[PDB]
């Protein structure tokens, strides 16, 4: 039963009879005395099969041989009882009735199929109003509805050759009487004649609809049910509960209602009651059926004997409890269990502990097989009695079934794909699943009672997958970045940080050791402390040769602690890794270097050795905490007195009327936070270097061994903040409003907290609780929304064969380089070959997996940008090629073929999202180069003024910082015309200012140096009588529109530049003469009568928050256009103004010669950051503010918007300090911008202004232009995830996460032969997933098909 | 037309309220069944 694609379509009546097994006729269900089923009601025997397997109803035939024969006495086909679960019987609805889905779906299926508004349909259905059905040709339009009196007259009007009905009979007559080819011809006609873009838009839309509805196999009248199938008997049971009370489903109730009303309508018809009776009955049957299907869209549900609305057939499919989401994805699972997890440090990391009793309950079938194999029980029942006695030998047999059999261990929320790891088992007394310790960071599981669940893999493919893909020691690299996720967490790092430190005068000072071995032989015997500085003879193995390991003895100058740590470090590492303090960051980059050098096996065995030695020496430290350990600063009482006197100052000054209440409140809170930081610093400097001890001499100070300080220094727990609260004062509790209270807590936890202070603490404490209660209950919404859009994406080609990637460089935000290049070109594969700055070479071939060796080379040669291939430009059809996704993975090699990267991408973006603030959250005029290094200017348009200084005449000149290496060390964004000092590509000195300009006011500095006059500057019309009138500064400043006359609005405010006589020199290069025109508020200072210098401020024109929560990421991927959209250029050419101030002033930009006429309407309440006489490049900042990603995509291109999104969301993470590699965001973007639009179809067959997705149109024009024909222009779109997931080739998928009803009905009318080959699809229909191991299988079926 | 102004406000503001819709609605119907229908339509 390897069937095919599934197929959906309308439910043709005779089809509904072929589904039948005999008409249901009566509303009975069972017999109230003998609980056999009455014949024939919702239940039956002859209709829906026998009750008991192979047994008649009356009981004539009761043997397997008699299967098939229908008993002559009660016609019950003696067959299995599961046939009671597959037979559908039908009802013969006397009058027809309208299917509610094809009536009230939203856009009415019948509405836009009959070309008729909905209210008239409700009229004809509920008998509001008559309606014509083929009224012939005398007077009446076909759809022309009527009312009572009008039909009464018209019967006198045209009693003959006339046809008017009302009820479902009417809609069915219309639909049947309709002929669709006629309407296609008529609609193509009015597409021809009626040339109105709105008009023929909707015209061609409806013709699209009708041609679709024709090219299905459907017929238009199948939407109006005549025959209505009953669900079987066993999907809506009538279970006998204990006590005679039966607990039936609700569909029995609804069908009972519908069968009642149908029979009653038939009974009314036999009598021929007056028309009010039959009309009310047909309405009742309509409501009954409409409540059967959906029990909604009708206005008011019909609740059962409860007050709770009774569920219905459109409601057993829908919801988070319908079969899709609740029983086709979340299903219970045999062979599972659970328990309280626990600690268990005696384990290698590839084996979870496990109880004897959970084992002997999970592996009963395995035990039974083995026990009938070793002849310890001849029959299986004997083996059951044995293993239920818990005898001696079933423990031996269980240890022989649990040798290599990996159990999957899961935790409650499984966010990221390390959440479900397998292990081997190790049988254990007890009932706690003794988990390993290291893996707890991965599960995110402390041991406060958390309960992990164990599954069991039954088959043999599943065992090889629970060993070769999900074993514990094959997922130590976090899927979201290469760093190991086996970071030693809390007791282990405190053990090492106590082990490898150095106190100044311990036993065994300075004595040399012959190696690590006698370092341990000294420590254990006690002749010398664990840490006291000591020469040893280590022997580190560096492996610079090709795979070699060149020994090199020496005498490193170390402690005993580092040396005894050295006996565990494997070969390839160098000794300078364990000679330092070994905090948490260093002890984790120990493992990181181990994995980057020696592969995976030594890193695994080394992480285990680290945990063992860490626990051992952490226990030997006796690292206890006691109440003498939290030292208060003795300079605390002074600081608190001093600040509590400064508040006295502000109180006295407030009651002198010098500062408002807001100001004194702010100043108070400012002096308290200052006292807080001072007291915290004082404690931390009484705490860190506090210990003072003495080597054979006077005294000396060192880092302390105050237990709380080691616990705060290692990285084990806490930090300087919690150490503040334990010793120094604890800040200012912030009341949950967000406003910070002004009464600080001058006490701390070593002291008490009197009643007020503790209580004020309560506010912020309970706000923290009330947020981490909403976060744990809404934690996976983002991963859910991403794997909805980015799921069916599978790395299904070895090499797409392109040369087009995105250019990588180190981000620099006007300062110290945030993210270098070795963190961004680490894994991705180059696009075009890389040339050392002389080109000198061919440094790296274009298809080289840039592992750390190649980053070594790139950082040895100082490469600045590496055009690397990227997921968003892969040229694969339904997939993403092998290389272009790069390499990143829990492994370290190139991504395999098929490994479902959409899911692990969405999870790389969604599991750290737990580690981000759920509330959104806002952080809040000269350039100063850092150090030595030359200056680098891009897009610089400078003028060599007669003054000497440098000024930029280009809007977008970036001020970089290059060295003699050539690297880009710093970059700064010069505003327009900043006063510049040094050279363009020249050398400067470190820490030296090089650029100054006007902070708020915009210079208009001239182009060349020539004489000056004025044009069209008449005061009152274009200019105003401005002057710094104490100085004589005649300023006839340009008048705005509200002060310029209505002809003044037709005037041109101007600044003419005259040559030496009265003419105007051409602008250099162009032929626009020498002058500058200016807008309103182009504040003029000087006048006609001076020769200008380059850099003349001819005018004076006046004039960042980073949300960092998770909701900033949600809105980034939603791609919502912001509030103030950054107005942006549209055509690369000269700028100008348009129709002046029709509410929104109109810009006008013009190219050299081409399609010039683009004018744009702008709310003139906002600055226009463009000149009036310039050539705005396409994709250029006319205005400011956040720029909409759609505009990026439409103006600049793909790679621009993708670099935008990745840098924006990377800002949102690395603000909080969370690492996530950019493959994942780029793949979610490649799922974002999937759809497309068309400009000119041309040699293809897509509608011009139609929206179609990129893969389809791209294969279409690729194969066409592969021919001799011509392609098709397409303008790429960009959808939010919540809308870019909203389109899906399958409907079985889109029936899960979208709202089910719209999906089902749209597919149903469209007759959409949904294939398989998704992942939601196959996980629903329960065959092999085509993602991981299943991919080869699906290639098998692909070969089967098409041959 | 004003109910169309309710429509545009629901578009912009991003939500509505029982008070908002009950403000903009067409007077003189108030059966509370037409109301529940129209509220389901605005949903």
């Amino acid at each position: 039963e390897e069937f095919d694609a599934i197929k959906i379509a309308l439910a043709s009546p005779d089809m509904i009879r072929s589904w039948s097994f005999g008409e249901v006729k009566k509303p009975e269900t069972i017999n109230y005395r003998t609980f056999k089923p009455e014949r024939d009601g919702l239940f039956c025997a002859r209709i829906f099969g026998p009750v008991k397997d192979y047994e008649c109803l009356c009981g004539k035939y009761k043997r397997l041989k008699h299967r098939g024969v229908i008993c002559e006495k009660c016609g019950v086909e003696v067959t299995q009882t599961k046939v009671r679960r597959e037979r559908m019987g039908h009802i013969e609805l006397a009058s027809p009735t309208a299917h509610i889905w094809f009536l009230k779906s939203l856009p009415s299926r019948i509405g836009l199929l009959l070309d008729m508004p909905l209210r008239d349909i409700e009229r004809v259905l509920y008998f509001e109003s008559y309606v014509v059905i083929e009224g012939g040709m005398t007077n009446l339009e076909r759809q022309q509805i009527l009312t009572e009196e009008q039909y009464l007259d018209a019967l006198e009007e045209f009693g003959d050759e006339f046809d008017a009905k009302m009820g479902a009979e009417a809609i069915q007559a219309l639909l049947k009487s309709m002929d669709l080819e006629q309407e296609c011809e008529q609609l193509r006609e009015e597409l021809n004649e009626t040339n109105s873009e709105t008009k023929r838009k909707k015209l061609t839309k409806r013709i699209k609809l009708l041609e679709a509805f024709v090219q299905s196999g459907n017929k238009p009248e199948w939407m109006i049910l005549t025959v209505l199938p009953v669900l079987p008997p066993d999907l809506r049971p009538l279970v006998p509960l204990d006590g005679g009370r039966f607990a039936t489903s609700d569909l029995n109730d609804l069908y009972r209602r519908v069968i009642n009303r149908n029979n009653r309508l038939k009974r009314l018809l036999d009598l021929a009651a007056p028309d009010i009776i039959v009309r009310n009955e047909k309405r009742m049957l309509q409501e009954a059926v409409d409540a059967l299907l959906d029990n909604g869209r009708r206005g008011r549900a019909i609740t059962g004997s409860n007050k709770r609305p009774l569920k219905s057939l459109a409601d057993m499919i829908k919801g988070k409890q319908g079969r899709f989401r609740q029983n086709l994805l979340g299903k219970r699972v045999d062979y599972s269990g659970r328990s309280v997890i626990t600690v268990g440090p005696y384990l290698r990391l590839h084996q979870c502990g496990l109880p004897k009793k959970m084992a002997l309950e999970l592996f009963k079938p395995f035990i039974y097989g083995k026990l009938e194999l070793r002849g310890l029980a001849t029959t299986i029942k004997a083996a059951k009695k044995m293993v239920e006695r818990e005898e001696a030998v079933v423990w031996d047999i269980l240890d022989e079934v649990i040798r290599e059999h990996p159990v999957l261990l899961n935790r409650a929320p499984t966010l990221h794909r390390l959440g479900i790891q397998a292990f081997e088992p190790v049988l254990i007394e007890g009932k706690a699943i003794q988990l390993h310790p290291l893996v707890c960071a991965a599960y995110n599981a402390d041991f406060d009672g958390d309960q992990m669940a164990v599954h069991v893999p039954l088959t043999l493919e599943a065992q090889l997958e629970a060993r070769a893909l999900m074993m514990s020691t094959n997922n130590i690299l976090s899927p979201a970045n290469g760093e190991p996720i086996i970071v030693p967490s809390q007791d282990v790092v405190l053990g090492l940080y106590y082990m490898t430190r150095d106190c100044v005068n311990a036993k065994g000072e300075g004595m040399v050791l012959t190696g690590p071995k006698e370092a341990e032989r000294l420590y254990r015997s006690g002749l010398a402390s664990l840490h006291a500085r000591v020469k040893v003879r280590i022997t580190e193995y560096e492996k610079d040769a090709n795979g070699e390991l060149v020994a090199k003895t020496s005498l490193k100058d170390t402690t005993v602690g580092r040396a005894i740590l050295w006996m565990i470090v494997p070969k390839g590492l160098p000794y300078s890794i364990v000679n330092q303090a070994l905090g948490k960051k260093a002890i984790s980059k120990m493992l990181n270097t181990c994995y980057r050098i020696l592969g995976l096996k030594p890193t695994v065995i080394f992480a285990d050795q680290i945990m063992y030695t860490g626990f051992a020496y952490a226990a030997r430290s006796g690292a206890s905490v006691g109440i003498d350990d939290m030292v208060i600063p003795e300079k605390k009482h002074e600081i608190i007195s001093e600040a509590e006197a400064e508040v006295a100052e502000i109180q006295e000054q407030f009651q002198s009327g010098l500062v408002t209440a807001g100001e004194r409140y702010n100043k108070v809170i400012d002096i308290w936070a200052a006292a807080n930081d001072r007291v915290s610093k004082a404690m931390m400097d009484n705490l860190q270097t506090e210990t003072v001890i003495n080597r054979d001499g006077q005294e000396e100070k060192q880092v302390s061994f105050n237990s709380i300080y080691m616990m705060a220094d290692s990285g084990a727990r806490g930090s300087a903040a919690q150490i503040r609260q334990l010793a120094g004062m604890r800040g200012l509790m912030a009341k949950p409003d967000g406003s910070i209270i002004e009464t600080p807590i001058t006490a701390n936890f070593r002291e008490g907290l009197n009643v007020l202070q503790y209580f004020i603490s309560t506010h912020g404490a309970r706000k923290g609780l009330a947020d981490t209660a909403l976060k744990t209950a809404n934690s996976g919404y983002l991963t859910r929304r991403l794997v909805d859009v980015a799921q069916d994406l599978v790395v299904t080609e070895d090499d797409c064969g392109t040369h087009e990637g995105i250019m990588m460089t180190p981000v620099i935000e006007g300062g110290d380089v945030k993210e270098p290049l070795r963190d961004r070109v680490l894994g991705r594969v180059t696009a075009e070959d890389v040339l050392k700055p002389g080109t000198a070479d061919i440094l790296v071939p274009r298809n080289t997996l840039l592992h750390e060796q190649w980053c070594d080379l790139l950082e040895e040669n100082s490469v600045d940008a590496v055009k690397v291939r990227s997921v968003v430009s892969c040229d694969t059809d339904f997939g993403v090629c092998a290389h272009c996704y790069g390499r990143d993975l829990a492994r370290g090699h190139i991504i395999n073929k098929g490994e479902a990267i959409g899911v692990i991408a969405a999870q790389s973006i969604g599991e750290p999202g737990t580690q981000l603030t759920m509330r959104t959250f806002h952080i809040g005029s000269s350039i100063q180069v850092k150090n030595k290094g030359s200056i680098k200017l891009s897009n610089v348009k400078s003028v060599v003024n007669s003054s000497g200084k440098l000024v930029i005449t280009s809007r977008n000149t970036e001020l970089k910082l290059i060295d003699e290496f050539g690297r880009t060390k710093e970059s700064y964004k010069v505003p327009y015309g900043a006063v510049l000092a040094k050279g363009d590509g020249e050398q400067v000195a470190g820490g030296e200012t090089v650029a100054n300009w006007d902070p708020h006011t915009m210079p208009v500095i001239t182009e060349v140096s020539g004489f000056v006059r004025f044009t069209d500057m008449i005061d009152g019309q274009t200019i105003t009588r401005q002057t710094d009138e104490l100085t004589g500064l005649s300023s006839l400043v340009v008048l705005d529109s509200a002060e310029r006359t209505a002809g003044g609005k037709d005037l041109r405010p101007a600044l003419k530049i005259v040559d030496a006589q009265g003419n105007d020199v051409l602008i250099p290069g162009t032929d626009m003469p020498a002058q500058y025109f200016l807008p309103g508020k182009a504040i003029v200072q000087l006048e006609d009568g001076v020769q200008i210098s380059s850099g003349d401020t001819l005018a004076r024109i006046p004039q960042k928050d980073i949300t960092g929560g998770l909701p900033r990421v949600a809105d980034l991927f939603e791609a919502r256009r912001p509030k103030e959209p950054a107005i942006l250029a549209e055509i690369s050419g000269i700028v100008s103004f348009g129709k002046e101030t029709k509410g929104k002033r109109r810009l006008v930009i013009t190219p050299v010669d081409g399609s010039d006429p683009y004018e744009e309407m702008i709310p003139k309440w906002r600055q226009l950051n463009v000149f009036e006489g310039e050539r705005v490049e396409r994709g250029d900042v006319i205005s400011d503010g956040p720029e909409a990603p759609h505009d990026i995509l439409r103006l600049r291109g793909v790679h621009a918007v993708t670099r935008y999104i990745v840098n924006e969301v990377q800002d949102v993470y690395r603000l909080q300090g969370v690492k996530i590699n950019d493959k994942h965001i780029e793949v979610i973007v490649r799922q974002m911008l999937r759809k497309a639009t068309i400009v000119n179809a041309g040699s293809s067959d897509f509608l011009e202004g139609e929206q179609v997705e990129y893969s389809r149109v791209k294969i279409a024009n690729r194969e066409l232009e592969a021919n001799g024909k011509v392609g098709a222009t397409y303008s790429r779109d960009l959808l939010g995830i919540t809308k870019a997931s909203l389109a899906t080739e399958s409907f079985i998928s889109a029936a899960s996460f979208q709202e089910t009803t719209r999906v089902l009905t749209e597919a149903a009318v469209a007759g959409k032969r949904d294939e398989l080959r998704g992942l939601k699809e196959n996980v629903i229909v329960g065959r092999l997933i085509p993602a991981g191991t299943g991919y080869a299988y699906h290639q098998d079926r692909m070969r089967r098909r098409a041959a | 037309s004003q109910l169309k102004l309710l429509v545009t406000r629901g578009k912009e503001q991003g939500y509505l309220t029982y008070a908002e819709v009950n403000d903009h609605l067409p007077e003189d119907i108030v059966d509370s069944d037409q109301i529940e229908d129209i509220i389901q339509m605005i949903n």
Binding site: - | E27, D28, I29, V30
Partner: protein, 50 residues
């Protein structure tokens, strides 16, 4: 400024407006509106601040 918005002028017009706002389409009437506004908030029957 609310008086600016206030269309109605005297007691009769206000009572009529309140009466039509309480129940739609019910024609306005003198004693009708008067009893309606007397029983909105001011009679023992339908209104009792405990």
């Amino acid at each position: 400024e609310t008086l600016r918005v206030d269309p109605t002028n005297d007691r009769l017009s206000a009572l009529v407006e309140i009466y039509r706002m309480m129940r739609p389409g019910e024609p306005p009437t003198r004693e009708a509106a008067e009893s309606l506004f007397e029983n909105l908030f001011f009679s023992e029957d339908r209104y009792d601040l405990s």
